[PDB]
Design a protein around this ligand. Structure first.
Ligand SMILES: OC[C@H]1O[C@H](O)[C@@H](O)[C@@H](O)[C@@H]1O
Ligand SMILES: OC[C@H]1O[C@H](O)[C@@H](O)[C@@H](O)[C@@H]1O
Ligand SMILES: OC[C@H]1O[C@H](O)[C@@H](O)[C@@H](O)[C@@H]1O
Lengths: 247, 47, 297, 247, 297, 47, 297, 247, 47
């Protein structure tokens, strides 16, 4: 691989790292990141296929409050890089897809670590605000942006100087009990994401609706859309009945 | 075992990846309905 | 401030998530996006500092729906430079009154309504090797995002006064109440159905009496055994002579999803104890690992 | 068959056509029409059995608003006539029953055609009312009654001078795709009958009850009587809560 | 008008459905049944024409339950001949105020309560060849129908004033509201359960992995294969190695009965577009035929 | 196929017609309940 | 009265269920428990008799939760000896206003919350032959029972006036209303699920057409017959060629549990006819015997 | 067996009979009655096992209003006595358990008979109250207590001078139709217990909740705890909506 | 038949009696919940 290709893939990884936290231009989405990585290396169509497949997989990965998303950015960069420097243009896609999912969790851990690390940054920003320095706050904000960019710029450059079957080998040389524990713990994480919401909105007036929803969910013949429609109807009836005696 | 499932109707078999669009559309519609009913707080679930 | 300063603020507002600390989520980006407005209004040594403290407070909403609020913050702050006696009264009021309800509609709209369909449309072309997929997704997302941000910021700045006082109205509170009820209902259903906690300890293995199992040792042979076995299963008789009852069966005998709701309430308590969500997630992973190691899960 | 028998069966068909719309003396019901046809022809007991069987089948065919019933009158007249002029007194009943059902749909189409045709009749009645002529309105009303009587008097007389296995032969010599399309379209017709009701009574405050009913109907363990009881209980609770704050 | 005129009106009211046009359903029969009353009250050249226009407006209810309304229409109109200043005020009001609620009770009472039981009782005797069945049905229906008509017409005429003003009361509106709620609920259930729309296109035929189907080629042979197949079916394994998913399955994945409710809403919209129900029914038959022809249905 | 079904518990086989009165009574009761719940607007359904 | 009199009353109140007649359940025990108080307050010839009639009226509650009421009855009565003009005004009202709601909480607490767990704990040790089980159960039950009675009687006596008038309050009314609603709901569910009435007459035995049953006489032979039988059962085909419909099936076609609720309503009517429950129970046993004799049940 | 053992077992039977109605010291519970009857006879551990097993069985036998409990006292006394005077200390327990259940029903019948007979006792107490005799009321109350004590003192002494396999023989030499009729009638008795409650609390505003509960109970996927939670939520919503227009 | 059931998880087979404590605890909890929901009026049911 040419050195210019290495420079461009590192720059694309940095851009994906920045847009993982910015989440505005969507340079961190697989549909863009994979084709950007494959365009600067010659593996254009294969990376387009990989990006399309991963985007089809990662259609619902969104950050909501403190519940961070599986961070499709690191998967998009790293799976595409491993596909590029491993041959097997089109036939190697199922391996990149297979290795992307645990690397998404790894990127989630990394971005959680960096968001935790961002707290002293805003503390220094407050301390500089008390001093009346308007430019150092901007400097610290840009440093925070660059930290999240580096968060992905580093692993993508590390992958470039190791054999292709290194992430896959590490994943395969992993004890089965660890894999099963991770799988079990991954189904209980979403509960935390629910708890944050429940803490936001929970009053003595709406808890009975929570009880009714929990009871109703045990009926397997009712779909999720049916449960949502029942909730909408109940809320509408409650609102209609509340303002019939008040006014 | 060689036919895995990755959610949203993606299979990615041992040789190729294919998407069945009925399941993908069902997953998209269900996720959108849950997001609109919960304000986008339904979480990440493999549909 | 002129339209140039407002466009500068709008462009600078695309980095509103740059820091995203866990304690005050978008305070840094919000303070960053207000820097040119603060420099344009307050100039001497101290009003800039007070503005910085004002805009470094807790702020969190959907990043694209933060533009109308900014516009209101642009409209209300400009009076303080001229003088309107409204200081620290509503600047901390509109932000907290808008960050919640506006996020509750911008998250489903952009993250789960526009983005999934745009990504599916792009991937449809991308799976055939067409470069038009990613290009279409990129352009369609970015044009819509920038247009929404600019239009909503301009609307918020222009109607700065007409909307800061209309927040205290029947429509907003009715929407909030209905959304709270619907969210409680659907989140209870999602806690029951999507939180997967399956125990696998075997509790009892009491054998069945010789009148309750099919007893596949004295059955008709050939085209009749199948029929009689199906009829016995229809009668409610069991396939195996031993009845295995697990901890999950006993938990489901009380109510399905009891472990899920108990874990959710424990997480609520831990979050109320001012414990960061990262610690709780890393503890849940370790709890799952341990439970698989000891056979509990 | 005697000519006097022909005269009486045509008269009974005319009476059944009249009571298809009048719906008071119930001369159009199978229980009366079949025995009237068989009494003037000598096939008394066989036509009584046929009428009893058809009435057991046609227990719920009632015209409600613009949702016309399957018009048991034409089936009752024509199946009885075909049973009479085909031999096989008691053993021919299952053929008359089999041919009655599509002929009920044919009579339904005919009666909707005549009901549509009745609009210019009442227009002429209005134009005569503005002229102050009190007897021409009566004459138009009697003409409208006689038109519906003829609607069934004609097919019954046409069936008399054709071989018995003519309706059955025409039904059997029908393409399978046409029969299947009619069967499929017959399950969606009742929806129209529902729509007319919904257009009548539908307010913004009762739509949530429609949503709850639609969601609840997906639970197969709940019977229709159970759903009705749930609706009654919900309506009672809503009424009780409505006047707890109003007064 | 004496009792004789009311008797003629009642006898003439049995042809109230004689015309039954689709535009104004029972206007013709209602006008026909009031002819002797109009001739008895108004006589010169013009009040008869005005009465005809009054009684040729839209009218529709259960034919037997129309007798009390007539009585009220008999009582209120007779004042106008003498003079009571109530002209075109309540004569139109009572008709529309009673045609709905009275039909809503007369239709279940006569069409679906009395007639089904009488028909079953008559058919019980008729299936044995007894002439007593049809005779009993005819006599029991005729006597009850005529007695109901005459008694309710007399009660409505004698209580002409006591009931025209009592319509505006809490009992009537409470009954109407409860009936509306119950009807909406039950009609939603009937739309979901009785409107049969089944699609038969096959969407996907993805084959199952070799760990999920029973694989009837390496199974125990004799009195144990059946047992192990039943145990695997209890575990959730599939009978066939290929999974067939139809459009109906995908539609039911969202919510059962979505096609039925969509068709019902389309029918409501078409009816609101002033399209006659005959055209809609004839178009639904053609739609079913076409859908069967193209394999959609 | 020779044993058809016409609703309300009527069979009308190849040689004779028979009525099972339990199904007929169930159909009558259900239709009456639906008519009373909907004001007689339940429509015609083969029970 | 001194503390000795109150202790004597409390000790004598452990025999409050000694008579337990069916007409006035605990009137005898209640009158027995108040004997020393009556002797202490009224002494001449007649006020004792009036007190006896006052305390011989209908009384029924949980035996342990009757101690506070006694205390209130101890406080209200002691004034009458001194003189407070409150005679037969509130002394009768507090008993009726407390016997119901307090029984509704003491029955679940003692009979179904403390006793089951104490018995399970004792039986755990008793199943191994340990005498510690029954001893622990006896001591833990009796100490708690006596302490509860004494403490609540003392509290009711000392708070004689503070609680007799607080009964007419919003909290008690809300508790009673919510308890009534919850009880109606759960008792309806229990009537549906726990009242077992299964009929076993066969109503119809119409045979199925030769397109609906599996027809186990022309099926594949060996490892394929099972598969095709399971596929046909999944398609809805019947196991047997004859369809048997029972009276229970026809009853469930209307609504499950109709017989149970009908029997419950009949029992309610019989009880309202002032028929003792023992006669109704003995009649239900005879009804079950007869129904089994005639094949109905 | 010694005569002193007979005296002690009769005394324990009398105490169990008294505590069947008193229900305070719980001498009628199997856990106490069985070990007391076995301690005065030398069969300590076997009676402790039997009492533990029976208490495990009789965990929910409580008298609630006029719905008398299965009267665990007579079973606890008699099954333990038959175990004691039949040999087979530990291995004879399943026979005592088997014979206890019908004897519980017999004791229920006996205690119902005595509760019915107690009515003239309180009538005499009233007639003595009108005479001003304060001690005769106490005497009648103690006589009523002793009557229910004797209700169990007599059968336990009768069982003492008959062969051990007498209750079991009588139960086995019983026609099958009678046993089946009793079993059928035992599933319908609880309905009476429900009726007494419904007659207590039943208003026109809580009946719809009864209808909803009856309808909901047909859904087998909803547990009893789920139904209770649904009822609590519905009651809370109803209470919240009731006082929003009232105040 | 030699394995009877007596409720609350008591078997009492032909030679010995055994208690499965999961079923006993489930019966206790369900009976307590029913008693608290009905004010102790749920009746005696063999759970
Ligand atoms: O609504 C919450 C909103 O703020 C959070 O900090 C970010 O994760 C956003 O992506 C999210 O949309
Ligand atoms: O309720 C509507 C009522 O009026 C319609 O015009 C007729 O179909 C009647 O048979 C029906 O009962
Ligand atoms: O709650 C009623 C209460 O009084 C009844 O008379 C007795 O059965 C008690 O055991 C019961 O607790």
């Amino acid at each position: 691989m040419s050195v210019i290709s290495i420079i461009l893939v590192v720059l694309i990884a940095f851009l994906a790292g920045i847009e993982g936290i910015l989440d505005e231009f969507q340079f961190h989405q697989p549909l863009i990141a994979c084709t950007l990585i494959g365009l600067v290396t010659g593996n254009l169509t294969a990376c387009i296929i990989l990006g399309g497949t991963l985007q089809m997989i990662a259609l619902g990965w969104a950050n909501i409050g403190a519940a961070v998303a599986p961070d499709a950015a690191l998967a998009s960069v790293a799976s595409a890089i491993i596909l590029v420097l491993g041959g097997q243009g089109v036939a190697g896609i199922p391996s990149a897809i297979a290795i992307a999912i645990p690397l998404a969790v790894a990127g989630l851990f990394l971005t959680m670590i960096v968001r935790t690390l961002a707290v002293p940054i805003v503390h220094l920003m407050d301390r500089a605000a008390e001093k009346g320095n308007i430019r150092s706050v901007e400097w610290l904000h840009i440093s925070a942006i660059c930290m999240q960019g580096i968060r992905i710029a580093i692993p993508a450059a590390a992958l470039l100087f190791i054999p292709a079957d290194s992430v896959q080998s590490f994943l395969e040389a992993m004890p089965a009990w660890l894999t099963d524990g991770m799988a079990i713990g991954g189904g209980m994480v979403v509960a935390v994401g629910y708890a944050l919401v429940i803490n936001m909105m929970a009053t003595k007036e709406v808890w009975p609706f929570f009880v009714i929803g929990f009871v109703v969910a045990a009926i397997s013949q009712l779909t999720l859309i049916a449960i949502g429609a029942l909730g909408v109807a109940l809320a509408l009836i409650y609102l209609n009945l509340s303002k019939m005696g008040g006014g | 075992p060689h036919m895995k499932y990755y959610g949203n109707g993606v299979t990615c078999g041992k040789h190729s990846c294919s998407v069945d669009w009925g399941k993908a559309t069902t997953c998209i519609i269900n996720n959108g309905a849950m997001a609109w009913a919960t304000g986008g707080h339904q979480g990440n679930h493999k549909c | 401030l002129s339209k140039r300063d407002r466009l500068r603020v709008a462009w600078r507002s695309t980095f509103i998530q740059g820091s995203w600390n866990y304690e005050r989520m978008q305070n840094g980006g919000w303070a960053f996006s207000m820097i040119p407005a603060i420099k344009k209004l307050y100039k001497t040594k101290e009003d800039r500092s007070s503005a910085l403290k004002r805009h470094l407070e807790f702020f969190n909403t959907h990043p694209y729906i933060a533009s109308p609020i900014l516009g209101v913050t642009l409209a209300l702050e400009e009076e303080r430079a001229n003088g309107a006696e409204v200081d620290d009264v509503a600047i901390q009021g509109v932000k907290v009154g808008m960050m919640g309800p506006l996020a509750g509609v911008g998250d489903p709209v952009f993250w789960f309504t526009i983005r999934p369909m745009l990504g599916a449309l792009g991937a449809s072309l991308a799976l055939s090797g067409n470069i038009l997929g990613p290009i279409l997704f990129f352009v369609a997302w970015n044009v819509i995002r920038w247009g929404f941000m600019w239009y909503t910021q301009e609307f918020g700045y222009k109607a700065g006064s007409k909307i800061t006082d209309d927040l205290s109205g029947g429509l907003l509170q009715d929407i909030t109440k209905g959304a709270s009820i619907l969210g409680m209902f659907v989140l209870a259903a999602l806690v029951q159905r999507w939180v997967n906690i399956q125990f696998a300890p075997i509790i009892s293995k009491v054998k069945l009496d010789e009148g309750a199992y099919i007893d596949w040792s004295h059955l008709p042979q050939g085209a009749q055994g199948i029929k009689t076995a199906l009829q016995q299963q229809q009668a409610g008789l069991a396939l195996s002579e031993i009845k295995v009852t697990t901890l999950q069966n006993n938990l489901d005998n009380l109510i399905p999803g009891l472990a899920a709701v108990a874990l959710t309430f424990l997480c609520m308590w831990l979050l109320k104890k001012k414990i960061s969500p990262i610690i709780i997630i890393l503890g849940l992973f370790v709890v799952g690992i341990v439970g698989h190691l000891i056979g509990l899960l």
